[PDB]
Amino acid sequence: EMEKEFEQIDKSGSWAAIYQDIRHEASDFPCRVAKLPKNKNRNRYRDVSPFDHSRIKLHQEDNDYINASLIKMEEAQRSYILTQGPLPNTCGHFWEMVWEQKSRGVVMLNRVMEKGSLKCAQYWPQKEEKEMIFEDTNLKLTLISEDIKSYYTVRQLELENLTTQETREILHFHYTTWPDFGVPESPASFLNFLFKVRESGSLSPEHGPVVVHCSAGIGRSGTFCLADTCLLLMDKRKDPSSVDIKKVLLEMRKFRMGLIQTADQLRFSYLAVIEGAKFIMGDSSVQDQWKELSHED
Ligand SMILES: CNC(=O)[C@@H]1Cc2ccc(NS(=O)(=O)O)cc2CN1C(=O)OCc1ccccc1
Numbered sequence: 061e062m063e064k065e066f067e068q069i070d071k072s073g074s075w076a077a078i079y080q081d082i083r084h085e086a087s088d089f090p091c092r093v094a095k096l097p098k099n100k101n102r103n104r105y106r107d108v109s110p111f112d113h114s115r116i117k118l119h120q121e122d123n124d125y126i127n128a129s130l131i132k133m134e135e136a137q138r139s140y141i142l143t144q145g146p147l148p149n150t151c152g153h154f155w156e157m158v159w160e161q162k163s164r165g166v167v168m169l170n171r172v173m174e175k176g177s178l179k180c181a182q183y184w185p186q187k188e189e190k191e192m193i194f195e196d197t198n199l200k201l202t203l204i205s206e207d208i209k210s211y212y213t214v215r216q217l218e219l220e221n222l223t224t225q226e227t228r229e230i231l232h233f234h235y236t237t238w239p240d241f242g243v244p245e246s247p248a249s250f251l252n253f254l255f256k257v258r259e260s261g262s263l264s265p266e267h268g269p270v271v272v273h274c275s276a277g278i279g280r281s282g283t284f285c286l287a288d289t290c291l292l293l294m295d296k297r298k299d300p301s302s303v304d305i306k307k308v309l310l311e312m313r314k315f316r317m318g319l320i321q322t323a324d325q326l327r328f329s330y331l332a333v334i335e336g337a338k339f340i341m342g343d344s345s346v347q348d349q350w351k352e353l354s355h356e357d
Pocket residue numbers: 105107108170240241274275276277278279280281317318319321
């Protein structure tokens with residue numbers, strides 16, 4: 061059981077060892093498509109690639125490759141697409157994927173510039189009157205509105221298939237204060253944001269999988285998805301004791317490499333799930349407490 065295990069790991073000072081065990085046991089599957097020479101400029105990082113078996117294939121229509129993986133959580137009955145921050149030449153591919161996969165939400169856990177470097181393209185419009193046209197993939201993208209909070213921003217976007225003139229509302233949830241290889245400021249700030257995504261209906265099984273990304277689409281993205289799936293599993297069962305966090309992480313790692321990048325991110329995941337369980341198991345009042353503690357205003 062996770063809280064008893066947490067205390068034992070904390071007491072014995074063994075987060076590094078627990079995390080290394082996970083790394084040791086994690087799946088290794090081929091990424092042959094990712095490593096084709098023609099795809100070199102579609103990958104942000106040499107050593108971060110989607111496995112062939114779970115890669116998202118684009119439907120157009122000359123080269124189907126995008127650095128993005130379908131994390132299909134069978135027991136939980138929820139799926140996520142985890143992807144790298146799009147590059148200057150892959151923003152059209154990114155939105156093509158959102159359209160084809162029928163996603164309603166995009167969760168962004170990084171900033172465009174981190175540590176002086178460009179870790180993600182400016183792939184969405186920052187001003188209503190300056191829409192983006194992706195001529196390669198025949199899509200238009202317009203900012204409809206935004207709600208700016210202290211550490212996150214929610215945007216309403218309209219994505220249009222220029223081929224058909226069909227339009228869809230996409231919700232963009234941008235966590236702006238999650239440092240690379242680091243953790244959220246508190247369980248409360250993380251959970252307040254996760255519940256904002258949940259409340260939107262973006263994780264509904266009636267939609268395609270939410271797209272989640274950071275810069276590599278593994279560390280911060282893995283942490284987010286691990287906490288969400290653990291919370292969902294205990295919710296379905298109304299049984300916190302039924303959830304084996306390490307097992308869930310290993311299951312996710314069947315679908316994309318390197319999910320959760322540090323031992324402290326693993327530790328934070330346990331904290332987030334232990335805290336979130338208070339809400340799942342019926343202390344409704346904790347949600348307001350997280351909102352207050354997050355200082356979102
Ligand atoms: C220190 N590592 C690096 O700088 C590069 C790029 C990067 C940016 C950012 C990042 N953090 S994230 O944006 O939260 O995913 C992770 C990685 C992983 N990486 C890798 O080379 O990862 C290879 C790897 C490691 C463990 C497991 C699978 C693959």
